[PDB]
Design a protein around this ligand. Structure first.
Ligand SMILES: O=S(=O)(O)C[C@H]1O[C@H](OC[C@H](O)CO)[C@H](O)[C@@H](O)[C@@H]1O
Length: 389
């Protein structure tokens, strides 16, 4: 009989392109069929679903696509089958480390990611503006362009203010730029002023009219779609957005530039480390076939295919200089130093509680139901119960 493998893929991760790679796998693997089980758009919705099926020890899923912040939970829970003993030296060290927990290899890298500043190069060029290196320059650039365009639909800055995993990244961008860390040598290190100032920064974009009043409703792919429609001057987003901006359903083909995120004044242009990996469910009754599929999907050939066809950043350093990759997406040639210096969200088996605390504080401030000052005190108090002190 055919082995019918089930692989969990987010609806936001371009399952139609993964399907092409899976079709190739089936064509070369007799007796194996793969079916995509669709996940929610954002990482924390995926986590709620996976917590439910893994807690029930449901055997139906075989391969799981997991966010870079998941390995500590999934390793300590015993929810994946480990690859320990495997040499990960072919992958970027960043992701070899992310997928190793207590020496146990919990998953194999799927693709890399980091946050970038997308900008409308046609608009900046019309107004004679260079890509901003600080959020303050970004504000001034937005005010000049918006006043000039007199376009009621043009947003200055789109970022993620919904209570989603991406809003954790939102909060940490200015915090890290100012040089602060949330976890220092394994212990919680919370800087109240920098936390308040991060929350105040995002709120100031809304208060000043540079971001729309309902940014508290905006998720990752909402930013993507609104910029793609031509309605946004500046967007914070991940690498996949590029393939959509240059695709057949775009209003901004050939009008998009990519830059590093702005810094706070006197800070560094830091960004958030993202990316995904493939795990074999510990409850799968297809352990052998599932492991073989993961080894294929995490191969250099598939990494190259997904970079070219889905703008997913590769997990192999050499692919950032591959002539086909850079012919398709020239700026990938400059992306590796951004990925390798991107800052990491906290590594903890209790990451879901950290995420829930931070993203709900961000969303509450942006929705106007909590002050930045109260938000930072609530965040610190709640994180002190979850993270080592
Ligand atoms: O799920 S959210 O969108 O809220 C936040 C996530 O965003 C990216 O992944 C989603 C992209 O669409 C992949 O193409 C990062 O890679 C990930 O690490 C991060 O947690």
């Amino acid at each position: 009989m055919d082995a019918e493998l089930k692989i969990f893929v987010s609806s936001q991760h371009q399952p139609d392109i993964w399907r092409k790679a899976l079709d190739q796998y089936e064509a070369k693997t007799p007796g194996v069929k793969v079916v995509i089980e669709t996940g929610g758009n954002t990482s924390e919705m995926q986590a709620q679903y996976l917590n439910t099926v893994m807690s029930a020890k449901d055997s139906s899923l075989d391969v799981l696509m997991l966010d870079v912040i998941r390995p500590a939970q999934f390793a300590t829970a015993g929810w994946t089958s480990d690859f320990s003993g495997k040499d990960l030296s072919a992958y970027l060290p960043t992701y070899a480390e992310a997928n190793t927990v207590n020496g146990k290899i919990v998953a194999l890298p799927a693709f890399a990611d980091s946050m970038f500043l997308y900008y409308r190069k046609d608009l900046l060029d019309k107004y004679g503006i260079k890509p901003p290196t600080t959020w303050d320059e970004l504000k001034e650039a937005s005010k000049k362009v918006m006043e000039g365009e007199k376009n009621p639909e043009l947003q200055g800055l789109s970022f993620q203010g919904k209570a989603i995993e991406g809003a954790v990244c939102t909060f940490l961008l200015p915090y890290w730029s100012e040089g602060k860390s949330l976890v220092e040598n394994g212990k919680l290190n919370f800087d109240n002023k920098a936390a308040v100032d991060s929350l105040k920064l995002w709120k100031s974009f809304v208060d000043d009219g540079i971001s729309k009043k309902n940014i508290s409703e905006v998720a990752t792919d909402d930013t993507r779609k609104e910029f793609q429609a031509g309605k946004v001057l500046f967007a914070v987003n991940w690498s996949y957005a590029w393939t959509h901006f240059q695709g057949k359903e775009s209003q901004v083909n050939d009008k998009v530039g990519v830059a590093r995120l702005p810094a706070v004044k006197g800070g560094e242009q830091t960004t958030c480390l993202g990316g995904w990996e493939f795990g074999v469910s510990a409850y799968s009754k297809q352990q052998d076939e599932a492991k073989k599929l993961v080894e294929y999907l995490s191969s250099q050939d598939v990494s190259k295919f997904m970079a070219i066809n889905a703008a997913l950043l590769p997990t192999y350093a050499a692919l950032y200089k591959d002539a086909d990759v850079t012919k398709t997406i020239p700026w990938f040639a400059d992306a590796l130093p951004v990925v390798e210096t991107a800052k990491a969200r906290p590594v903890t088996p209790r990451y879901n509680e950290v995420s829930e605390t931070i993203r709900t504080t961000v969303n509450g401030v942006l929705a106007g139901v909590m002050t930045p000052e109260d938000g930072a005190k609530q965040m610190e108090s709640r994180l002190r119960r979850v993270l080592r002190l």
